[PDB]
């Protein structure tokens, strides 16, 4: 199962050639393409539940597309070739290539509501989370558990007009903020890894990114909590007549409930978790993380690829 | 004089409490204050040549202020408490706290003109620059002298409307661009250090920032070329009235001329060279670089600061 | 087939509990057992070509034993549970757990003779070796082809009475020696990897160890040359009776000939390549290398093993 | 005061040229020589209390030799150009170049007894140490504090016939052992640093090395305890009529009692704390640690020295 790392390795190597060239679609589509090629060489029966979208506007890794050898139990397949293609195109930090796999039918439905509100923290402080409490009370309880003062805390938040109130409320408590322009899968995993410089992720981001992060959290530990975030009353009603209680707090296991979860990622640009891909004459080096829920084993994998063998 | 790193460590630690708090002046002010206190306890006599500004719009580290306990040969002093207070106040990457020292009277005057066109590269390509040439020609010349493909080169550039043509021209060359929103001292240093991922810095930034980057380039090797870049005709005459040859190409040694040059910097937020201030139960870590032109020795310094108490908190691991 | 790294991780973790406990056979036995269990759950069909020994003096991983769940193309299997049980049992540096796999019938027979004279180097100097020449000549040839000074070269050598002349000759050359007390699979790999600090391995060690080192060198690049080294006339005829040309120079591909070669290793104690097993409240870390000749891809793998429970212990940081 | 790192940098660079050349005295004396040259360029008034020995058999850094500029308060100077010159000469790991400085008269007398029995552990478990208890009880109490099982513990012990009983007793408890052929300054500092792989140092080693280690422990935290270890009844009587209670447990502050302690070290060969010196065409890189008791600041310093500037 470790062999699934070659999928994000291939995605990151493809996107790595487009880093800093200012073409979002070029790099994104090249990563999609390398990953779809490599996943269909892998001994698995998978169905894309999270990918590039519906087949009418996404030719590759559309929702429902079957992937893999064809061998093995059919399972849920979530893929994010680049978590924030703009970071890749501008040469910014913390762009990652991501993939998760769970038991079929155990990944929360990514299409119910576009956005969800999120909070995430690592294993030491996971027990104190309450996304219905004000962010200030989450910060103080998390800080006390970590033996930090509140002014030592660092909260990762997407830089968005919608987060003006949240940003104001975090600042009022005294904690530092790490504003990111994109990439709250990376932000969420960083909140849960030790000595990353990020102690907490908060705010609204993509529902599919919330499920991908939960897959990671299932394997490495920590918690994410979420609540669906209808944009308008239309999506609010669509959600209610799909069956959802909007007072409902989703825990990690509500987003990904399988017993067999797999997650891996490979760095595209340098981030606070993974170094970006580096190209050399002889080849190139990728930096990846790989993890499984059943063992709880976490692997850091640095790979030196030899494409050719020069004079 | 490794002790001067404590100036940037103090400035970074002070600014660390303001990261992401959306108050650029609070953070600068905190950094300014901490650096001034620490600099007046070191055994240098210095005059602030590059600082906050002039005696009236800047209450601390103003141009001309004396710094240091009192003893030592009088020397030129340059400090940038945060290179890009906005990276600090939003919690974005590559904010650093910067200090440079050089022999007295050896630093280019930073009030000549506000802005300066720049191009900087590391030692491998240091004799190949021509800032009067178009960027395409510079990229090609630097690529060939490093036996690299143009499509493999990365240019660091400030993301500004004034750089629409420069950015287009780098891209049409086939080179890559790392777009920064602020911080071309850090970008200049990143270009000059060998295995950084950045081959080149180009574009118009602040004149004081250009001179500080020159001090670092003096110690670590490489070159920067620059020209003054007046913003309108009033400034062009303001400069010309002062005797400036607005066609002169300024080199590294034009900006900082002495043979005793010192540079150090400390990470405020995480960057491509220095990690930012990291907080722990017992204290914090800072990540600094210290450089000296006389010897050419470069030092990467990682420090744990106990805030405070002698083993009442667990031990912390580094790097 | 990255899954095979779990074989050496299991062997290292088992041996980890015996480090410094002064019981070489307990540690080997623990490692042997753990590797056999884990290897029989992977999807290979293999025959043990290099293992503990013959069916009667070795109860587990004996020569000829079949391994793997049952499916897969039959292939050659080499395992060294600890390369130097004595480094393990005293808690000294550079103990590793080793596995190699190659196409069936492609591994040199390890019972031909117990010992083998060896010299190994990385890809830069791979065509310059001559094991029939004196070491002085080899050191000089390797130095020149890497544009290095002889006085800068480092030779890894087993500390043995039988190596008094070899050691003297390296020293008189002006080269350096890293003296190891055991472990010339690790020494061979250290010589072959580029920026390791070791330029060369030389001397007589075990024949099975030479073949395992060849499998790694097949994947990562470089060369080993060897000759069989009988310990007395009885063994010389024992070899010669078997059809061995005791004057043949064996190369890398003589020892391991297939085109599908796999090698992986895991640190038991801390070494110049792999960290040893490290223990934590929630579990342990292992440090492995995995290599494949077909693609030439080299993987450094750091793993945290939860022993056990899902977030009941603090998070651990790596590398 | 950080400028004192250049003394161990110079010692390690000098010894670094002799690494792996099989000449103990060559490398040792070259390190002594580089360090004595560089210390006399430093603004300090110092007197060698720990060095190469008495002046009749040690020309440089003998006991009582005055070192430094001559400027500043006179202080205690302890130096160990290489902690185990055999490691340097054979190309073995964990050879370090070491220097400590304290207030004059505050370093315990290195010449009273040749050997002392030692135990050392880091800041988290320092409070449980009792060198008069059996080693097994120290191991279990240290393990419990660290939240480790006893089989997770690793004890550093000098490989010596005198330690046969200790080695047997540690093995009987179930803990692992890291046997070192030389260098229990390095062993002691490693026991006190986190994530070094060593959790405890135990056994008898040189009294001067015990005082140098205590200097380090004064700055970084942890504890060392010691008891003098007379070889014979002669040294036992010499110690008694010098005034020493041999039932006395020496704590860290009994070995180095100043309020102003400084300690630094530079790696000679690669160790579990510091990388060894690496030589390049342009120059060389040293790896050092520097620490002060009054602030408790610990610095890791990687230096890239440019001796020349080639074609
Ligand atoms: O850009 P939006 O619409 O605010 O949505 C945020 C989402 O976009 C991304 O930044 C990139 O697609 C995700 O990481 C994040 O969840
Ligand atoms: O922000 P401006 O006015 O375009 O000028 C750029 C200057 O500002 C900074 O980004 C920070 O003040 C400097 O690094 C740079 O020299
Ligand atoms: O110990 P001997 O008999 O000299 O042979 C050396 C062999 O022993 C080992 O050191 C460990 O058994 C091997 O690495 C090496 O091949
Ligand atoms: O070699 P001995 O006499 O047992 O003494 C041990 C001492 O020798 C050293 O290994 C090197 O001088 C010290 O680290 C240690 O304290
Ligand atoms: Mg995304
Ligand atoms: Mg600035
Ligand atoms: Mg560079
Ligand atoms: Mg062996
Ligand atoms: Mg090598
Ligand atoms: Mg010593």
Author numbering:
A (entry chain B), D (entry chain B): 0 to 310
B (entry chain A), C (entry chain A): 0 to 318
Which passages does the manuscript contain on this structure?
MtFBPaseII catalyzes the only unidirectional step in the gluconeogenesis pathway of the pathogen. MtFBPaseII comprises the only FBPase activity in Mtb and is closely related to the class II FBPase from Escherichia coli. The MtFBPaseII monomer is a compact, globular protein with two distinct α/β-type domains (I and II) arranged in an alternating multilayer fashion to form an α/β/α/β/α-fold five-layer sandwich.
In addition, we present structures of F6P-bound forms for two variants of the active-site residue Thr84: an inactive (T84A) variant (2.3 Å resolution) and a partially active (T84S) variant (2.2 Å resolution), the enzymatic properties of which have been described previously. The two variant MtFBPaseII structures differ with an r.m.s.d. of 0.265 Å; the r.m.s.d. between each variant and the apo structure is less than 0.4 Å. The F6P-bound structures contain one magnesium ion in a position that is proposed to bind FBP, coordinate the 1-phosphate and stabilize the transition state. This magnesium ion is coordinated to Asp79 OD2, Glu208 OE2, Asp82 OD1, F6P O1 and glycerol. In the T84S mutant, the O7 atom of the carboxylate group of malonate is 1.1 Å (0.8 Å in the T84A mutant) from the O3′ atom of the ribose moiety of AMP.
